[PDB]
Amino acid sequence: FKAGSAKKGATLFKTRCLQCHTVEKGGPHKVGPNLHGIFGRHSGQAEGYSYTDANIKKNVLWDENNMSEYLTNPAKYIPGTKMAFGGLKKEKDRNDLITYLKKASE
């Protein structure tokens, strides 16, 4: 987590972020919020855009390090991603499903 290239910088952010984010001061919102000064300004706190209620469980402002963890799997925090392919949040639900599945599949 030190430095990096700038020319692939514009490319990588254009390859993987431009579709959902702008950055320049006063930039428009997209499907995702504009990122002007994402440091200092607390996380999930861009005016003109209210977030999913995931910002309420995890919200410590990003830095050079702990944000890099967010770009490993940002979808982990987007709501409905668990449920998509059969995710069950409640353990009693997983218990009941596994109870049924053990007998139905054998």
Phi and psi at residue 56, to the nearest 5°: -85, -25
Q: Is 58 in the site for its own copies (CB under 8 A)?
A: no
Q: For ligand HEC, what does the binding mask look like between residues 45 and 84, x meaning CB under 6 A?
A: xx----xx-xx---------------x--x--x------x
**Pick 1 or 56: Cβ nearer its own copies:** 1
Closest distance to its own copies from the beta carbon of 56 (Å): 18
Task: Mark out the alpha helices in the chain (DSSP H runs).
Answer: 7-16, 66-70, 91-104
Note whether 26 and 43 are within 8 A (CB). no
Residue with tokens 């469980």: 57
Rounded CA-CA distance 65/46 in Å is 21
**59 to 40, 44, 55, 89, 106: CA distances (angstroms):** 13, 7, 6, 20, 44
How many chain residues interact with ligand 6UZ (CB under 6 A)?
A: 13
Instruction: Give, as ranges, the residues between 66 and 105 that touch ligand 6UZ (CB under 6 A).
Output: 66, 69-70, 77
Give the interface with its own copies as residue ranges (CB under 8 A): 1-10, 12-13, 16-17, 20, 23-24, 32, 35-39, 64, 67-68, 71-76, 78, 81-89, 91-106
